[PDB]
Design a protein around this ligand. Structure first.
Ligand code: NI
Ligand code: NI
Lengths: 58, 58, 58
């Protein structure tokens, strides 16, 4: 059914996908753990290695 | 696309949201991390720190 | 809102649904935690204990 993944308030994330060196974002933070991060960028929810993500506390 | 996050069977979760002292729930458990849990309450999927969550075995 | 959970590239997962002994899949891998994995099988996103999942790097 329809649902919404509420982001972790007061955080924004810049990230890189796979091997592309371009920074993407800012994006929302959904989860962090196991040396990885879950981000939501518009309608796309992606898993990114922690060192491929810059987390910023607004 | 359209999808459903199936809850972890035989568990319910009461949780505290943001700055409201009243407990919400019972909600579904989607994921149990070491420091936080992912819950689903109706169409809302939220990340709650373990200290603000009460996992019930039913 | 509408969104898509992008899978972790180059992984295929076979799994069992709790009691049912029949193997299901191939499914996409969304998250590999400690003790469990999150998989997507068409419209269903499920949490599977690690012992009940076979992750294949292809
Ligand atoms: Ni729709
Ligand atoms: Ni979803």
């Amino acid at each position: 059914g329809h649902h919404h993944h509420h982001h972790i308030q007061n955080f924004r994330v810049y990230y890189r996908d796979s091997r592309d060196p371009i920074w993407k974002g800012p994006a929302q933070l959904l989860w962090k753990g196991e040396g990885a991060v879950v981000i939501q960028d518009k309608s796309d929810i992606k898993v990114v290695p922690r060192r491929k993500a810059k987390i910023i506390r607004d």
